[PDB]
Design a protein around this ligand. Structure first.
Ligand code: ECH
Ligand code: ECH
Lengths: 304, 302
């Protein structure tokens, strides 16, 4: 068993690879078209889905950068946004790249509010997308909400020129914690994984892993080793709600066990308004430690 | 005008972005599935489309790596190929990454022949692709040949974790052909096409502004004469550009923008694959190339 070979467990699992396909098409676009397309997608999505407000701490971390942009003239504001989209090498792009995804998202949330108000240069009036851009937006608007928000998030995270993160919130009080139930699955490691993540208890969660174990987020390469996985939990995985439904348990090579669970996950950005269809694919060693876990965004509810 | 803003000229040009979409899907796959998928695509494509043999110089440059793999036991051979697909950090992967695209392609051409012959571990008998991988292969097989070969090339180039073929002397001046483009007599555009068709990179590069850029299909702009010239020498030998028609318009600051459409042949396939291409030029007032983008078009309808 290697981490990279483990990526192949449960090969029947149909991931929503339209997401990275769409991000790839988006990434080809002219920067102004990238910005306008997201503006359009954002505006129309906002008619039925409300984005949660960025946290106070996140806003403080992005404040300096936001103030600099607000102080610029309109042409310069537009240029700064194009710089981010083009991944140009500028001080602002370097600052942006140092930020965790949540801080990047909160930065754009605020710019969006300011553009709506006319305090930061808006997308030009009557702007029409390029041929390729119009098709990309059409694709996005045809996707399930869980896929739409993943496309938008990944586009945002990709910006800037490549560590600052929000403070780590204390774990949930033990007596207040809920426990998940999974049809077919009573495996203690899997249950403890879900329960500890739901309680933001990253120190306990990381102890479930082998020293060389990995976690693979949707459409990303495996994050390998306890140090890197713990960093990822602390920077990116706060305040999720995992709602696993059902699973299946099978023996693997060398006394290992492989378990696939399907269910839903909510991000604090949208709460119960977007339930993403997710699979977890675990490979556990003979002692029950996590050697590998992959988290996949599923192609449709037909994959649960 | 910035290089990055110039990327937006002629915005109704519909590029074949199914190519980078498909590469992105492919890149998500398990490595063994990546290898099997390409094996399948390769085998089926080869029933109607023959790949030209790698050049002698290229083969010599890849020879040591190929010999090392051939000396391995079958399990190790399979692992070595998986390492390349996974972009693992290994000596072989580092050597591979140092190679120009043509050398990487020739390396896999040879491994393909050896797998067919049974001298390098083949894809396991009766191998079945994953759900996601089967769909990716279906997409590829539905594409026009020019798009298929671009997907395969880009997948190959992406593998692994400063070595190029020797530069071939430019074509004898008296032997050179000249292109004709309906609607377009612009000397810079004509000289661009004619010099590239003659492998005359030293003359070609002089058409560019010092800070000018060239943007290959689905890649970021390559900026400045040093980098553009390097790209010509490493990657752009022995092409055949067959421009057909164009359109010429004024641009800002006394600049001119010109779009040309036509076909291009790669020496890997010759006339057997004609790729539908657009060139989008932005020329300064003196006629120098500030920006040229080369796009693979979505269909002949473009
Ligand atoms: C840019 C831009 C603009 C603003 C755009 C904005 C404002 C976009 C905001 C988008 C947001 C807020 C998207 C949030 C999406 C969040 C998602 C998709 C979270 C998914 C998390 C999951 C699936 C986690 C699953 C996990 C599990 C279950 C595990 O078991 C282990 C950990 C982990 C893997 C993490 C404007 C409009 C100005 C126009 C100009 C350009
Ligand atoms: C991996 C692998 C295998 C072998 C795969 C092989 C063997 C694949 C070979 C593929 C090849 C040989 C593809 C070649 C494609 C070449 C292309 C698509 C060239 C396009 C060039 C263009 C469009 C240039 C246009 C330009 C123009 C016109 C300009 O004006 C400026 C310059 C430039 C921009 C360059 C096997 C089976 C073992 C299985 C295991 C894994």
């Amino acid at each position: 068993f290697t981490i990279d070979s483990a990526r192949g467990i449960f090969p029947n699992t149909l991931a929503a690879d339209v997401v990275p396909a769409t991000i790839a098409r988006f990434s080809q676009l002219n920067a102004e078209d990238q910005l306008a397309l997201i503006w359009f997608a954002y505006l129309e999505m906002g008619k039925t889905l409300t984005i949660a407000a960025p946290g106070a701490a996140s806003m403080q971390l992005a404040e300096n950068a936001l103030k600099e942009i607000q102080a610029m003239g309109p042409l310069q504001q537009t240029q700064a946004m194009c710089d981010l989209a083009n991944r140009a090498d500028t001080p602002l792009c370097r600052t942006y790249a140092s930020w965790s995804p949540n801080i990047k998202l909160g930065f754009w949330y605020r710019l969006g509010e300011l553009m709506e108000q006319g305090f930061v240069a808006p997308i030009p009036a009557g702007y029409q997308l390029s041929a390729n851009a119009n098709a990309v937006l059409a694709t996005i608007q045809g996707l399930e909400s869980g896929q739409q928000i993943t496309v938008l998030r990944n586009a945002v995270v990709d910006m800037g020129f490549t560590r600052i993160a929000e403070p780590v919130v204390p774990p949930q009080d033990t007596a207040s914690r809920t426990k998940v139930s999974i049809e077919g699955v009573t495996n203690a490691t899997v249950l403890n994984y879900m329960d500890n993540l739901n309680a933001n208890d990253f120190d306990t969660l990381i102890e479930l892993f082998t020293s060389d174990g990995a976690l693979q987020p949707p459409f990303q390469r495996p994050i390998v080793g306890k140090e890197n996985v713990l960093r990822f939990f602390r920077e990116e995985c706060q305040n999720l709600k995992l709602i696993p439904e059902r699973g299946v348990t099978e023996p693997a090579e060398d006394g290992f066990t492989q378990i696939k669970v399907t269910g839903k996950v909510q991000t604090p950005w949208f709460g119960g308004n977007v339930g993403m269809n997710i699979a977890w694919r675990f490979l556990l060693n003979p002692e029950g430690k996590i050697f590998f876990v992959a988290i996949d965004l599923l192609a449709s509810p037909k994959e649960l």
